Structures are given as structure tokens and as C-alpha cells.
Amino acid sequence: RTVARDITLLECVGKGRYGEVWRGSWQGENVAVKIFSSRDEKSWFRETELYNTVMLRHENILGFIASDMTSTQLWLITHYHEMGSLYDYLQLTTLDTVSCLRIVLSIASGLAHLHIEIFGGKPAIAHRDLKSKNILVKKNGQCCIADLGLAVMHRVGTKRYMAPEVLDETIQVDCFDSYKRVDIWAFGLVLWEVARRMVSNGIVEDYKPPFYDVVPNDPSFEDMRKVVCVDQQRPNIPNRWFSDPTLTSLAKLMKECWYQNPSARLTALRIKKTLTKID
Amino acid sequence: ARDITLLECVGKGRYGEVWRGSWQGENVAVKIFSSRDEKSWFRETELYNTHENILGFIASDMTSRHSSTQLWLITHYHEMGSLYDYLQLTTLDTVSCLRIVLSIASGLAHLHIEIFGTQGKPAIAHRDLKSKNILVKKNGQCCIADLGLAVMHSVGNNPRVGTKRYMAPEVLDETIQVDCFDSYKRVDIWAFGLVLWEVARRMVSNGIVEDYKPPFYDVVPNDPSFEDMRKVVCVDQQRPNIPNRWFSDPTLTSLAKLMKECWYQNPSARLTALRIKKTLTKID
């Protein structure tokens, strides 16, 4: 029998320090192909090792197809999501109560699935690089979490999204729950980025990245540590949110993701429960 | 062109399957790992992410749809098969014998030795040397295969690994210094010694040759257990017998001395891969 391994690379949909992502084709079907830079080689090994241990299958987790090493090119092949990243989608799109709640509930579902140990099954997983660029929008209005390059099974990540215990290096490195709590911090920021683009009473905010008003682009560790750890600043909740019951509930939720004390933050399971009681 | 055609299965076992295949009109070997051996696939893939006497890497693939995963390793194909196979129905002369064993020594020295620069390699202990893990090339030289238990140094945890028949005494009595990289290189030399013995037996001298036998064929039951090997190697302190006819031949007399120096109970007493390459280089 023949093994069709011809993956056609059609257009580049992303370039960065990580390498490149390509819309590709395998046997008619659209696939996404990540070509790892030498800089990010370790991420391919971490992610391949994870999927060699547990084959994750969840509607809110970017779907694995293949990990390939060729003579050295390192490739990750996934399902393709033509709508692109939540980051990209939020720039050009506003949301209503239904689309906003569908997006944030699907992210919480995907994250709770990563975090939970299932017996029989999967180990518990912390993502450690959650951000709006690492979330993709599906045609059914749900999202999926992508990029398990830094994932841990039971510092690193995007500086703008790092929890204060990461920035001030007080994180208990030998405690798995520490890495879950770092994920909730970043989830709280993503929730803020999405809520801003939900219309209420004819009002919406601009797309802005977290801490857009207090740090430059490509903020330094020191920039982030001063804002988040020393000054203990948190993203602004606009007045207009408190005229909307959904945005009022989401504001309370994001505050409970942003405590300086990691152990005080909500769990993914508790956020999922709270979000189902909202509308 | 990435289209791989699977033509014939050349091997099946606990490890999975191996297949002769086609890929851009060239012959390739395709190992499909068993779910038992999934850690070996990942370990081998990290090793190969770094020579004429190491099985040549082409690709490594993890593929999945739903709950089903396939692990592939694609390498160059060697028509003449494993040294194990080759020694079954072939006898050797001085020239063939030395070329085989010098090539294996060369590969193992290359694995064992750290090279520096941007084009280099760490030091590697193989940990699973046997005649089935060596392949015969058409130029009569060999290459070492199966880096799935290999260990790098600039660790590899779990138990008591390798092929029982080739396990060193420190592996069988489990006194091996698990944190010591040199221990693992020394395990290789033991196993290499047993491979020298398998090969030397098939070299004709003065019109005499021994038939093919695996190490300890005569002293353990067929399909020996870990305990069976421990008894003969550790308790009885047995080593493969040197046929007296070898002592009439200068080459086999030198090879007998070499394999004795691979078989010390003291690992530190054993020769290094490099010393073996140099001694074998001096024999003619």
C-alpha cells in the first residue's frame, strides 16, 4: 500500500521567532503546518513528547495530525482554522452577548480539559503560553487553544501575559498547581481582551492588548515586573460594563483570575461552572 | 515527493514491524513501532536530531487521527540484512572478518566520542548492541542500528534494558552505576566482545570454521530469562569458549585476546572502543 505523505504548502499565514505557519493541503483536506525555527527546536520535542504520551482530542484544543522530522526540518501538522487567531478576529469584529459567551466558554472548556487529570484518560497539563494569538476561531463560533510547545504534564511564555509570580520569580517551580494558576492569570487577560469587543448599549472598546496603556510594544521583563508586581496594576474595567449584566459578571470573573496570591485565583473547572450560569 | 510505498515486511516482533519501501525511486527501510516501544521511538528521534557505520536517518513521523497513533522511523535500506542473518549462511576469510569488525569498532568509537563546534555531536552509549542491530553493506562494511535505548552525554532512567544474551554482568546483577555515563560505554564493549566472538567463529583458518551460534548458546536454555543469564555470567563467571584452532591463526589469536579484554568482570578494566579500533587497525 502507498503512504501519501505529499503535504502541499500553499500560503504562509504566520512568521515569527517560532518559525512559520503555512496553510497546506494533504489529500484534498486543508492542514496547518508549523515549521519550527532552530531557536524553537525544544518546543517541537516538548510537544511531540506530550502527544506521544497522550493523544489529546477535544473540540476546544487544536487537533493534532502529525509531528515530522526530515533530513533537520521539524514540522507540526494540525487542523486548519480559516478564520484564524482570536487576536486577528478581535481586531476587525465586535461581538454580542451570544458570540462573546460562546468564545469565552469554549476557551474555559479547552483549558479545563487541559488542566483536569482523567483516570482510565489523560495527565493534567498546564499550557504556560495562553494568549489571544494562541487561540483560533472555528466557524461554529467556538475557539480552540493552540501551541503546547511549553506545556507541562503531571521565565518562559509571552512577557505581556506572565503572572506576577513568574515575573518576580516567586513561583513554586516544584508544584504543578503553580503552572495551572499561571494559566488562569493569562485566561483572565484574554477574557478582558474579548469583553472589550462585546457591544452593550451601542458602546464597544477598540481592540487593545493587555497593559497597552502602561508598557511599550515588546515590553521588557523589567517593564512588566514594575507594572504587575511592584505597582500591582491590573487592566481597566470601563464604566459601561457595569450597565451590562454579562460584562458585570465577566469583570468579577477576570478580577478572580488576577489576584497577586496564586492560590486565591479561581480554577478552570470553577470558571467553566460560573460561565454556564451567565445568560 | 514524500510518497512511501511499503513493498515487503522484512521483520515483525515485540518492537513492531520493519518494511522494505520505495521513496523517490530509492529503497528505504520503514520501522513502525509497537505501542510497547513508543519511548524508544521518541528517544531514537532525539538521538538522530544530531557516519558510514551508523544506520542513516531519512525521517521520523508521529501520525494520529482519533485515538490511533502510528510511530514511523525511515532509514536507508541494506539488502543483505543483519550481520546476524549474514553470519548464518556465510563463512569469512581474514579480509572480510577484519573489515566487518573494524567497521563496527569504528561506528562504536564514533558513537562513544564527543566532537565539538557547530557541526559536532555529544557522546552516545548504544546499550543494545547485538548482531541483529548491525546491518551488512555491499562494500562488506557494517553499520550500527537501533538508537532506541541509546544515552547521550555532553540521562536515560527506567530499569535493566537490552538483549538478555548480550547483557554485561553489572546489568544482570544490577550493580551498574545508573548515574555514570562511562558505565554505559562499558556495557557496549562487553556486547561488542560477544559480537567479535560470533563473527570470528565464521572466519575459516587452516580449512576449519565453527557454525553460527549466539553468545552462551551452549550454557543457557533457548529464549533465556534474565535470571538464566545472571546465573551463567554472574554466578558461574562463564565467557564464550575460544576454539583451540584459533591459536594456530595469528589474526584469530589477536581477536581472541581482544574479546577477552572486553569480558573482564571489572568494567573499568575493559578496553575502550578507541583502543579496539586501533588494535584492529594494526591487525592485517
Ligand SMILES: COc1cc(-c2cncc(-c3ccc(C4CCN(C)CC4)cc3)c2C)cc(OC)c1OC
Ligand atoms: C509517515 O508520514 C505520514 C503518513 C501519513 C499517512 C498516510 N496514509 C496512511 C497512513 C496510515 C495510518 C495508519 C495506518 C495503520 C493501519 C492499521 N495497521 C494495523 C497499523 C497502521 C496505516 C497508514 C498515514 C500515517 C500522513 C502524513 O501526513 C498527514 C504523514 O506525514 C508526512
Ligand SMILES: COc1cc(-c2cncc(-c3ccc(C4CCN(C)CC4)cc3)c2C)cc(OC)c1OC
Ligand atoms: C497558534 O499556533 C498555531 C496555529 C496554527 C493555525 C491553525 N489554523 C489557522 C491559522 C491561521 C490562519 C490564518 C490566519 C490569518 C492570515 C490569513 N488572513 C486570511 C487572515 C487570517 C491566522 C491564523 C493558524 C496560525 C497552527 C499551528 O501549528 C501547525 C500552531 O502552532 C501550534
Ligand SMILES: COc1cc(-c2cncc(-c3ccc(C4CCN(C)CC4)cc3)c2C)cc(OC)c1OC
Ligand atoms: C494522520 O492523519 C490522517 C490519517 C488518515 C488515515 C489514512 N490511512 C489509514 C488510516 C487508519 C486506518 C485504520 C486505523 C485503525 C483501525 C482500527 N485498528 C485495527 C487499528 C488501526 C488507523 C488509521 C488513517 C487514519 C486519514 C486522514 O484524513 C482523511 C488523516 O488526516 C489528515
Ligand SMILES: COc1cc(-c2cncc(-c3ccc(C4CCN(C)CC4)cc3)c2C)cc(OC)c1OC
Ligand atoms: C535493527 O534495526 C533496524 C534495521 C533496519 C533495516 C535496515 N535495512 C535492512 C534491514 C533488513 C532487510 C532485510 C532483512 C532480511 C534478510 C533476508 N530475509 C530472509 C530475512 C531478513 C533483514 C534486515 C533492516 C531490518 C531498519 C530499522 O529502522 C527503519 C531498524 O531500526 C532502527
